[PDB]
Amino acid sequence: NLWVTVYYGVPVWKDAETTLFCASDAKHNVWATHACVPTDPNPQEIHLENVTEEFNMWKNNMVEQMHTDIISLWDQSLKPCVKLTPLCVTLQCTNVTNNITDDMRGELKNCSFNMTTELRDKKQKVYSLFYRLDVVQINNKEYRLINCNTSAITQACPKVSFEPIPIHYCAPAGFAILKCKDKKFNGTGPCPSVSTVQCTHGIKPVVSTQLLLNGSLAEEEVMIRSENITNNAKNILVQFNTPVQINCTRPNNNTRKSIRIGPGQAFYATGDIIGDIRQAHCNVSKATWNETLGKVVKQLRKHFGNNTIIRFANSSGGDLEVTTHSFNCGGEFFYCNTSGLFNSTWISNDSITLPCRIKQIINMWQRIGQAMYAPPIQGVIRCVSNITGLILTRDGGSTNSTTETFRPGGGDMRDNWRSELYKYKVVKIEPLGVAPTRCKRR
Amino acid sequence: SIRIGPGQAFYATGDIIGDIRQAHCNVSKATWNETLGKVVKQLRKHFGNNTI
Amino acid sequence: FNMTTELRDKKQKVYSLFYRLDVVQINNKEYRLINCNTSAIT
Amino acid sequence: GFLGAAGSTMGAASMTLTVQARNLLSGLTVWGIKQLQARVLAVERYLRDQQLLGIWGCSGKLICCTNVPWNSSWSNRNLSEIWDNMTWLQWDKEISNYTQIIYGLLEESQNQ
Amino acid sequence: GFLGAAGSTMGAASMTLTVQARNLLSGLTVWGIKQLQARVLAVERYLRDQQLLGIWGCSGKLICCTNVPWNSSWSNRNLSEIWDNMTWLQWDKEISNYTQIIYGLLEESQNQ
Amino acid sequence: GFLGAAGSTMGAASMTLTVQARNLLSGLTVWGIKQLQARVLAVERYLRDQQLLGIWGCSGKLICCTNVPWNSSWSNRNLSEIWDNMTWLQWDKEISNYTQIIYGLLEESQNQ
Ligand SMILES: *[C@@H]1O[C@H](CO)[C@@H](O[C@@H]2O[C@H](CO)[C@@H](O[C@@H]3O[C@H](CO)[C@@H](O)[C@H](O[C@H]4O[C@H](CO)[C@@H](O)[C@H](O)[C@@H]4O)[C@@H]3O)[C@H](O)[C@H]2NC(C)=O)[C@H](O)[C@H]1NC(C)=O
Ligand SMILES: *[C@@H]1O[C@H](CO)[C@@H](O[C@@H]2O[C@H](CO)[C@@H](O)[C@H](O)[C@H]2NC(C)=O)[C@H](O)[C@H]1NC(C)=O
Ligand SMILES: *[C@@H]1O[C@H](CO)[C@@H](O[C@@H]2O[C@H](CO)[C@@H](O)[C@H](O)[C@H]2NC(C)=O)[C@H](O)[C@H]1NC(C)=O
Ligand SMILES: *[C@@H]1O[C@H](CO)[C@@H](O[C@@H]2O[C@H](CO)[C@@H](O)[C@H](O)[C@H]2NC(C)=O)[C@H](O)[C@H]1NC(C)=O
Ligand SMILES: *[C@@H]1O[C@H](CO)[C@@H](O[C@@H]2O[C@H](CO)[C@@H](O)[C@H](O)[C@H]2NC(C)=O)[C@H](O)[C@H]1NC(C)=O
Ligand SMILES: *[C@@H]1O[C@H](CO)[C@@H](O[C@@H]2O[C@H](CO)[C@@H](O)[C@H](O)[C@H]2NC(C)=O)[C@H](O)[C@H]1NC(C)=O
Ligand SMILES: *[C@@H]1O[C@H](CO)[C@@H](O[C@@H]2O[C@H](CO)[C@@H](O)[C@H](O)[C@H]2NC(C)=O)[C@H](O)[C@H]1NC(C)=O
Ligand SMILES: *[C@@H]1O[C@H](CO)[C@@H](O[C@@H]2O[C@H](CO)[C@@H](O)[C@H](O)[C@H]2NC(C)=O)[C@H](O)[C@H]1NC(C)=O
Ligand SMILES: *[C@@H]1O[C@H](CO)[C@@H](O)[C@H](O)[C@H]1NC(C)=O
Ligand SMILES: *[C@@H]1O[C@H](CO)[C@@H](O)[C@H](O)[C@H]1NC(C)=O
Ligand SMILES: *[C@@H]1O[C@H](CO)[C@@H](O)[C@H](O)[C@H]1NC(C)=O
Ligand SMILES: *[C@@H]1O[C@H](CO)[C@@H](O)[C@H](O)[C@H]1NC(C)=O
Ligand SMILES: *[C@@H]1O[C@H](CO)[C@@H](O)[C@H](O)[C@H]1NC(C)=O
Ligand SMILES: *[C@@H]1O[C@H](CO)[C@@H](O)[C@H](O)[C@H]1NC(C)=O
Ligand SMILES: *[C@@H]1O[C@H](CO)[C@@H](O)[C@H](O)[C@H]1NC(C)=O
Ligand SMILES: *[C@@H]1O[C@H](CO)[C@@H](O)[C@H](O)[C@H]1NC(C)=O
Ligand SMILES: *[C@@H]1O[C@H](CO)[C@@H](O)[C@H](O)[C@H]1NC(C)=O
Ligand SMILES: *[C@@H]1O[C@H](CO)[C@@H](O)[C@H](O)[C@H]1NC(C)=O
Ligand SMILES: *[C@@H]1O[C@H](CO)[C@@H](O)[C@H](O)[C@H]1NC(C)=O
Ligand SMILES: *[C@@H]1O[C@H](CO)[C@@H](O)[C@H](O)[C@H]1NC(C)=O
């Protein structure tokens, strides 16, 4: 004598996709955190006892949503800023002298041109300084901006800062965010220690290549993650146990000048560099890097054998963004050469100096048709950061190869934010059940 | 294609290789006659049986 | 006709073919697009 | 708190239904529209569940007994190994095949 | 299915109320806003109907009996020619005049 | 009409609850989004109140008796000077301290 009894509010969930919203701690920023909900001081995390879940790092939709949101915010931030259409003219450029060094020879050019005024009746002869990577010669000499045959340039608004700030992703009503608490989780498979939350930890959208900066550290050991470790077409994500400090600087004392190109529209050009001219560069610690590489190769020798020679070489081909460590240091975009970091072989006080280059016409998100111009920054620039990860790729050495070669990679930013959203998943609650009892309706 | 600015193109007509003739449509004569006969037969229900 | 270039400094002499219904003569001969006194073309 | 008894037996999770019940309703223009749609969808899901409960005769209840007898072909386990040695996540995976038949029986039993 | 008994008598259409009940809740930016408003309006109409039913004392019911006697001045037809010789579309046209009086009587009878 | 008995005693205002009950549900793109959010928020508030009432065991009611005895430490006034010499605005200002305790007691009493 058993009867069907209905229960509403049972702990059952399913896998689902939804739109998560943004929250930030409680003004001109690229990612408009002022429009996001303020965050609670003490978030609730509920450990689910005796619960085992299945996670997949490489088929997560939070990564896609985060990529789309970042791209959309970047596009939105450039709407009210000045268009630089009259800047696509012919420039007359000369080489820069007066206290340049040997390594800085030919990197700066002094270009004069004619520019429109606030009156639609006359011109003005002005001049500026351009980096060699921003101008292409058309046959002193005649140059043009690198972009004036493919796209249009918008000048970045100088009051908006590029500094990343932490953001949190929250689930709507009827959804939960499951979080894996295993300390040696390798991205895919069963996690037996699970908690539930509604918000993720503060994630800073740092854009960089070949090196992960200002991120999270593994709790126990260096972690190696890959979708298919035997497939050499997949990238390898390496997570450090301790960070590696890196100091980058542009030492030139720059000057900024404002040129009126129309009614209520100004253009910020580079003036003169007071003093000498030197090359921007980064410093890393040699001993710390050696120890980190030793730990990385120690962890790598668990998938490829115990007696295999493991050697690190540098990048192989590509454009400037993918063959260099590209990042942003206080409004200036750096492209640094990492041939001194990934160059060694391993058999079973000092510093490393990486020279860098500066560019001012920026194409982001591997797109074409839209370009941004970064106005110059005044004074000497210095930044300090943590290296907390690596992106690597393996060469497909066939014909009985006893050695493996790993090269730095990158280019796709989904793997930058896949190294932070790797322990979260989104579930949808289904609070309706039926079961046999001995109670009958009266 | 003619480039008229940074990232802007204009598609013009070039040269017509061969002779130049007029665009045109063809319809069937008998089918159109039959259709017009049916249409006038249906129209003759609102205006009379002896109206031209 | 003369058309602007990708550089805001110089022009180029180009040509095209137009149907008679799209050009109106303004007193070879001088013509203009039929729309350039009433509206803009996209 | 929320989803606390997901690893506990079916019996232990029957005393905390209100925790999950109350965490289903409140717990530029492009982003403004996206957030609004989620809030409308949660309300729609809640209203559909409430309408189904009302149609079954169980409006305004968390636990509701019915007049529909339990067919032994849906499950053969006895009450000792269901309410004391089983979780809801396992029970759903087992009775997922017969859910629609039971729902139709509930509807037609309440109507008649 | 839906609106199937629109031509049947009032008695025959009284056994399929669930079909109509279910099909009232789920059955660029310019177009996005337009679709959202319809979904909000359907929810609002459903909630107003549910509130009215709850105020009358008939919450969570499809057929509900009341304590308000039927005035013969609203309609003099007997039960044989109402439930067996008439449809709801004809009945609404006949009693459209007295609807507000009946609603007020229901409200004040349930409250008192 | 609406809020008419705000200056009357608690006893007199208990006979016009439906007036306030009804006036809680229906009574460029920038402005279009703002107006939609107001309606969504009103619907959400109404649904939260209805869920709370249903959890307390008072689904579809305006006045509901409970099994929770009144603690004398919440208020010592007798019924003659509460329902006949007091308004709801004054009563709320006095019992605002003990509201959460009473709500928790109601929930745990109905569940058990
Ligand atoms: C990883 O994180 C570190 C630590 O947070 C971070 O280093 C920080 O970089 C920022 C940006 O360069 C530094 O903040 C600057 O510091 C000085 C003093 O205030 C000024 O140059 C800047 O302020 C001026 O510019 C602002 C922009 O509008 C104006 O609002 C302001 O009025 C000033 O004009 C700015 O505040 C910060 O000091 C460092 N922190 C440390 C400890 O060095 C690093 O950049 C991160 N790495 C990456 C790759 O993002
Ligand atoms: C860049 O070139 C400009 C001229 O195009 C230089 O500015 C002139 O410098 C000379 C020599 O010192 C002065 O006499 C002029 O008065 C300056 N101004 C102008 C408007 O001609 C400028 O010094 C050059 N800068 C660098 C870094 O080489
Ligand atoms: C991971 O990649 C390897 C290749 O690196 C895949 O193994 C291949 O499997 C195909 C058949 O599916 C064989 O023809 C190839 O010879 C295999 N290659 C090697 C090098 O052994 C493997 O299937 C991939 N794993 C998954 C899960 O997709
Ligand atoms: C990186 O380290 C180098 C080398 O120490 C610094 O460059 C200068 O190096 C010379 C010797 O080659 C020293 O005499 C100078 O003192 C160094 N400069 C300074 C400012 O101390 C370089 O400055 C370092 N860069 C960073 C960003 O730390
Ligand atoms: C990067 O710069 C930091 C300071 O911003 C350096 O840290 C200093 O190192 C010196 C030399 O050992 C110490 O005397 C100071 O006390 C340190 N300062 C702080 C605040 O810790 C750091 O050494 C630099 N790193 C590299 C690789 O050059
Ligand atoms: C990787 O390192 C190699 C070896 O240093 C680089 O090859 C050098 O390229 C430069 C020009 O860029 C030549 O002057 C050198 O002679 C080359 N060296 C050798 C040994 O052939 C290569 O460019 C580096 N790849 C990068 C930085 O992407
Ligand atoms: C990155 O750095 C490496 C090592 O410094 C560069 O390789 C040198 O390139 C220069 C010319 O730039 C050659 O004269 C040297 O002979 C190269 N060194 C070796 C050991 O081969 C490499 O070119 C740099 N990559 C760039 C500048 O793109
Ligand atoms: C319009 O074109 C269609 C074909 O696109 C013509 O149909 C063809 O007529 C010829 C001549 O009788 C037949 O041999 C072909 O088999 C037909 N083709 C098909 C696909 O049916 C049609 O006659 C043309 N109509 C007119 C009015 O010229
Ligand atoms: C600016 O205009 C002058 C005067 O027409 C011209 O001679 C010169 O080539 C132009 N460009 C410069 C100075 O770069
Ligand atoms: C623009 O000019 C550069 C430099 O001459 C050339 O390499 C590139 O192909 C051009 N872009 C297009 C889209 O033609
Ligand atoms: C970098 O590492 C240091 C040392 O662990 C830590 O205190 C700091 O918060 C890290 N992050 C940044 C952004 O500097
Ligand atoms: C990750 O761990 C799972 C078992 O938990 C294993 O099947 C899988 O191969 C591992 N992947 C890598 C890249 O080590
Ligand atoms: C850069 O130049 C400015 C202007 O002369 C000066 O005030 C400042 O001290 C300089 N900064 C240096 C030399 O680091
Ligand atoms: C890094 O460690 C390796 C392996 O012990 C050693 O051969 C090499 O000299 C070290 N490099 C340093 C200390 O700069
Ligand atoms: C590889 O060598 C290490 C050396 O510490 C050893 O611990 C490990 O078991 C070896 N793995 C094998 C032989 O698969
Ligand atoms: C790479 O390492 C070799 C061996 O130590 C060294 O000779 C060479 O200069 C290095 N290349 C660099 C640091 O670019
Ligand atoms: C169409 O019908 C008319 C009227 O009967 C007739 O005069 C004419 O010849 C017909 N045309 C044909 C058959 O091509
Ligand atoms: C018109 O003539 C047709 C010929 O078929 C006939 O059927 C119809 O009744 C006539 N209509 C009249 C005379 O109104
Ligand atoms: C183009 O410009 C030239 C040079 O100023 C002028 O003579 C001519 O009339 C213009 N128009 C043409 C070629 O249609
Ligand atoms: C534009 O020009 C045409 C052709 O000359 C003329 O007929 C028409 O009236 C003009 N339109 C206006 C609005 O003046």
Torsion of CA A335, A340, A344, A350, to 10 degrees: -140
Chain B within 8 Å of A147 (Cβ-Cβ)?
A: yes
Interface test with A, best of D22, D31, D107 (most A CBs within 10 A): D31
Structure tokens belonging to residue C41: 């073309």
> SS3 for B37?
helix
Structure tokens belonging to residue A14: 């399913």
How far, in Å, CA of F95 to CA of F108, rounded? 20
Q: Angle at the Cα of A66 (from A65 to A69), degrees rounded to 5?
A: 85
Structure tokens belonging to residue A219: 């709790």
Closest alpha carbon to A329 in A164, A171, A219, A136: A164
Maximum CA extent, chain D: 57
| CA atoms within a 13 Å half-sphere pointing along the CA-CB vector of A224 | 17
Closest-lying ligand to the alpha carbon of A245? 5
The answer to whether the CB of E66 falls within 8 A of the CB of E111 is no
Beta bridge partners of A13: A429
DSSP C4: E
E14 Cβ contact partners less than 8 Å away, ≥ 6 residues apart: E63, E83
D23 Cβ contact partners less than 8 Å away, ≥ 6 residues apart: A173, A429, D2
Instruction: Tell me which H or E stretch contains E102.
Output: helix E99-111
For every residue of E62-92, DSSP letters joined together read SS---SPPPPTTT----GGGTSSS--HHHHH
How far, in Å, CA of C17 to CA of B20, rounded? 13
Closest alpha carbon to A148 in D8, D13, E69, C7: C7
Q: Angle at the Cα of A178 (from A173 to A183), degrees rounded to 5?
A: 160
DSSP F112: -
For every residue of E13-57, DSSP letters joined together read HTT-HHHHHHTTTT--HHHHHHHHHHHHHHHHHHHHHHHHHHHTT
Question: How far is CA D79 from its chain centroid?
Answer: 19
- Cβ-based contacts of B5 with chain A (< 8 Å): 85
- Cβ-based contacts of B16 with chain C (< 8 Å): 17
* Residue F54 to residues A158, D59, E59, Cα–Cα distance (Å): 56, 9, 12
How far, in Å, CA of F5 to CA of D107, rounded? 44
The answer to whether the CB of A156 falls within 8 A of the CB of C13 is no
- Give the neighbours of chain B: at least 3 Cβ pairs within 8 Å: A, C
Indicate the length of chain F as a whole number: 112
The answer to whether the CB of A359 falls within 8 A of the CB of A135 is no
- Other beta carbons within 10 Å of D88: 23
Closest alpha carbon to A329 in A361, A270, A282: A282
The answer to whether the CB of A164 falls within 8 A of the CB of A134 is no
> SS3 for E59?
coil
How far, in Å, CA of A177 to CA of A427, rounded? 6
Residue E74 dihedral angles phi and psi, to the nearest 5° = -75, -40
The answer to whether the CB of A137 falls within 8 A of the CB of A90 is no
Q: Which amino acid is at F89?
A: L
Q: For ligand 10, atom 2, which residue shows the shortest CA distance?
A: A149
Q: Is D13 left (phi over 0), alpha (psi -120 to 50) or beta?
A: alpha
Letter string b/e over residues A356-368, b meaning 16 or more CB atoms within 10 A of that residue's CB: bbbbbbbbbeeee
Structure tokens belonging to residue A252: 């030139």
| CA atoms within a 13 Å half-sphere pointing along the CA-CB vector of A84 | 26
Q: Which residue of D has its CA nearest to E33?
A: D33
- After which residues does chain E break, using C–N > 2.5 Å? 27
Beta bridge partners of A270: A256
How far, in Å, CA of A399 to CA of A401, rounded? 6
Q: Do chains E and F touch (3 or more CB pairs under 8 A)?
A: yes
Burial (Cβ within 10 Å: 0-12, 13-18, ≥19) of residue A32 = middle
User: Which of E15, E39, E60 is facing D54, going by the closest CB pair?
Assistant: E60
The answer to whether the CB of A218 falls within 8 A of the CB of A359 is no
How far, in Å, CA of A74 to CA of A413, rounded? 14
Match 């280019």 to its residue by tokens.
A411
For every residue of F36-99, DSSP letters joined together read HHHHHHHHHHHHHHHHHHHHTT-TT-SS---SPPPPTTT----GGGTSSS--HHHHHHHHTTSH
Q: Do chains D and B touch (3 or more CB pairs under 8 A)?
A: no
CA of A278 to the centre of ligand 7 (A): 18
Window 67-106 of A: residues touching C by CB (8 A cutoff) are: 85-86, 88-90
The answer to whether the CB of D19 falls within 8 A of the CB of D31 is no
3-state secondary structure D32-83: HHHHHHHHHHHHHHHHHHHHHHHHHCCCCCCEEEEEEECCCCCCCCCCCCCC
| CA atoms within a 13 Å half-sphere pointing along the CA-CB vector of E27 | 11
- The verdict on the CB of residue A193 being under 6 Å from ligand 13 is no
Beta bridge partners of A247: A283, A384
Match 């390798």 to its residue by tokens.
A186
* Residue D68 to residues A2, A4, A379, D75, D95, Cα–Cα distance (Å): 9, 6, 81, 15, 16
Residue F66 dihedral angles phi and psi, to the nearest 5° = -130, 175
Interaxial angle between packed helices D29-56 and E29-55, expressed in degrees from 0 to 180 and rounded to the nearest 10:
30
> SS3 for B11?
coil
A84 Cβ contact partners less than 8 Å away, ≥ 6 residues apart: A152, A153, A154, A155, A267, A373
3-state secondary structure chain A: CCEEEEEECCCCEEECCCCCEEEECCCCECCCHHHCEECCCCCCCEEECCCCEEEEHHHCCHHHHHHHHHHHHHHHCCCCCCECHHHCCCEEEEECCCCECCCCCCCEEEEEEEEECCCCCCEEEEEEEEEHHHEEECCCEEEEECCCCCCEEEECCCCCECCCCCEEEECCCCEEEEEECCCCCCCEEEECCEEEECECCCECCCCCCCEEECCCCCCCCCEEECCCCCCCCCCEEEEEEEEEEEEEEECCCCCEEEEEEECCEEEEEECCCCCCECCCEEEEEHHHHHHHHHHHHHHHCCCCCCCCEEEECCCCCCCCCCCCEEEEECCEEEEECCCCCCCEEECCCCEEEEEEEEECEECCCCCCCEEEECCCCCCCEEEEEEEEEEEEEECCCCCCCCEEEEEECCCCHHHCCCCCCCCEEEEEECCEEEEEECCCCC
Maximum CA extent, chain E: 57
**What resolution in angstrom units was achieved for this structure?**
3.0
DSSP C22: G
- Cβ-based contacts of A83 with chain C (< 8 Å): none
Residue C18 dihedral angles phi and psi, to the nearest 5° = -125, 145
Question: How far is CA E5 from its chain centroid?
Answer: 15
How far, in Å, CA of A271 to CA of A273, rounded? 7
The answer to whether the CB of A284 falls within 8 A of the CB of A341 is yes
> SS3 for B36?
helix
How far, in Å, CA of D76 to CA of D65, rounded? 20
The answer to whether the CB of A397 falls within 8 A of the CB of A403 is yes
Strands A236-250 vs A281-285: parallel, antiparallel or unpaired: antiparallel
How far, in Å, CA of A227 to CA of A290, rounded? 27
The answer to whether the CB of A143 falls within 8 A of the CB of A111 is yes
Burial (Cβ within 10 Å: 0-12, 13-18, ≥19) of residue A12 = buried
How far, in Å, CA of A267 to CA of A155, rounded? 8
Match 């270039």 to its residue by tokens.
C5
Residue A271 dihedral angles phi and psi, to the nearest 5° = -90, -115
- Cβ-based contacts of A18 with chain D (< 8 Å): 38
Interaxial angle between packed helices D99-111 and D29-56, expressed in degrees from 0 to 180 and rounded to the nearest 10:
60
Instruction: Tell me which H or E stretch contains D104.
Output: helix D99-111
Q: Is E57 left (phi over 0), alpha (psi -120 to 50) or beta?
A: left
Method by which the coordinates were obtained: cryo-EM
* Residue D64 to residues A131, C31, C39, D60, D103, Cα–Cα distance (Å): 76, 85, 70, 10, 14
Structure tokens belonging to residue A319: 């454009």
Chain A within 8 Å of C9 (Cβ-Cβ)?
A: yes
* Residue F43 to residues D19, D47, D50, E70, Cα–Cα distance (Å): 22, 11, 15, 35
Closest alpha carbon to D68 in D28, D42, D97, D106: D106
Q: Is A330 left (phi over 0), alpha (psi -120 to 50) or beta?
A: left
The answer to whether the CB of A74 falls within 8 A of the CB of A162 is no
Structure tokens belonging to residue B34: 């039959």
Burial (Cβ within 10 Å: 0-12, 13-18, ≥19) of residue A390 = buried
The answer to whether the CB of A248 falls within 8 A of the CB of A356 is yes
Strands A403-408 vs A309-312: parallel, antiparallel or unpaired: parallel
Q: Do chains F and D touch (3 or more CB pairs under 8 A)?
A: yes
Indicate the length of chain E as a whole number: 112
**Alpha-carbon gap: F100 to the closest alpha carbon of chain D (Å):** 16
| CA atoms within a 13 Å half-sphere pointing along the CA-CB vector of D69 | 4
**Alpha-carbon gap: D97 to the closest alpha carbon of chain F (Å):** 31
Q: Angle at the Cα of A307 (from A304 to A310), degrees rounded to 5?
A: 65
Closest alpha carbon to A195 in D2, D92, D90: D2
Closest alpha carbon to A14 in E46, D83, D88, F91: D88
**Alpha-carbon gap: E22 to the closest alpha carbon of chain F (Å):** 19
The answer to whether the CB of A323 falls within 8 A of the CB of A215 is no
For chain B, the C-alpha Rg in angstroms (whole number) is 25
- Other beta carbons within 10 Å of A24: 19
Instruction: Tell me which H or E stretch contains B49.
Output: none
